[PDB]
Amino acid sequence: GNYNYLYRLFRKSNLKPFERDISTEIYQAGSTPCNGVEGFNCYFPLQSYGFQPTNGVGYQPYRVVVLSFELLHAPATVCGPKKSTNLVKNKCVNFNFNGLTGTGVLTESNKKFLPFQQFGRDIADTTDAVRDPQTLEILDITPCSFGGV
Amino acid sequence: AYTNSFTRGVYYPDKVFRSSVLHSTQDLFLPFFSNVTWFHPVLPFNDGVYFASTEKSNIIRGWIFGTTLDSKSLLIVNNATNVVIKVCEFQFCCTFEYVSNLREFVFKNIDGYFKIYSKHTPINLVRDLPQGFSALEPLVDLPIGINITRFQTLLAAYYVGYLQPRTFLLKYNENGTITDAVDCALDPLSE
Ligand SMILES: *[C@@H]1O[C@H](CO)[C@@H](O[C@@H]2O[C@H](CO)[C@@H](O)[C@H](O)[C@H]2NC(C)=O)[C@H](O)[C@H]1NC(C)=O
Ligand SMILES: *[C@@H]1O[C@H](CO)[C@@H](O)[C@H](O)[C@H]1NC(C)=O
Ligand SMILES: *[C@@H]1O[C@H](CO)[C@@H](O)[C@H](O)[C@H]1NC(C)=O
Fold this sequence. Notes:
The structure is cut from a larger assembly and holds 2 copies of chain A.
Chain A: E1 6-8, E2 27-28, E3 42-43, E4 46-48, E5 93-97, E6 100-108, E7 129-131, E8 138-142
Antiparallel strand pairs in A: 1-4, 2-3, 5-6, 6-8, 7-8
Bound molecules: a molecule of 2 linked components (NAG-NAG) and 2-acetamido-2-deoxy-beta-D-glucopyranose (2 copies).
A molecule of 2 linked components (NAG-NAG) sits between chains A (12-13, 15-16, 19) and B (67, 147, 149).
Domain BetaCoV S1-NTD (chain B): 1-191
Region (Putative superantigen) (chain B): 173-191
Protein name (chain B): Spike protein S1
């Protein structure tokens, strides 16, 4: 029986998202103050898992990894295996800047981006300008010509 | 002591550039014309804090955060030329380690992330915070995941205010800097 893995069994309130509580304060389950002394209604908040190879699959140990990432609002440092391509201006093209995809014309801009800002936005919440991930230059995005026939 | 936080405490709520627009956004802000406490001590960290310092030789350097604040919590300290943030249960009179006029900071703890915004601006005044407007761009997002209910500075007077969930109407100019704002609950005209 492997008892090295623990879980918190008691707590005065539920955890907020991504909160981390490693405290070992004695939990007072009754009206008697514990004063740091374990006993009746005074429990150690942690309890060990019972992991034996003969245990049922429901009681078998599982390893869990949760990847948390926030999507495009700022410069990025973790990308997929996707390759890159040269850049062409003044022609309607399909652009993909750091996973932000779209279609339009990219032109030299006069916008003054701050170091923590990746891409701009239009009044319609559509992207208006972007920062080229390889060259620190601001490209203005203008949808290419259209109209009724 | 107490003083009036005329229009300060506004910070870029998003890392997205905008220009020549009036954008409305709701978040934890410092209400306009609020009573901010002036210290020439431990304080609560209810829902975020606006801190301000006027310095001549940079006496104030550090912050302590936590519930009990004594070896059972965050610590921040500016050693000469190196910001140092730790979450060890330090001994004062580890699961994280980070290493890098008027100064204004905003501290927020949302979903276990500690957001620190900080501006800087020269001023010639010795009474209180000057009247004016400026925006506090973000500087740090920290994945502490640590409970917060109190803080205390470490040092030159300073100013402390508290944030509330108030809607604001930020004015982005041609160059993308917030030049003006309107608290949506300050007064009838503001509404
Ligand atoms: C973070 O720590 C604070 C301690 O300051 C917790 O607040 C306590 O919550 C319990 C819940 O029943 C109350 O009985 C205490 O009176 C609270 N203490 C204070 C000083 O207000 C808070 O619950 C903790 N956060 C979470 C998510 O549990
Ligand atoms: C990445 O691109 C920039 C500009 O395109 C260049 O200066 C830099 O050397 C490149 N880095 C590598 C590792 O090739
Ligand atoms: C924007 O920057 C230009 C210089 O690039 C300057 O002339 C202009 O005054 C700035 N606009 C504002 C509103 O500060």
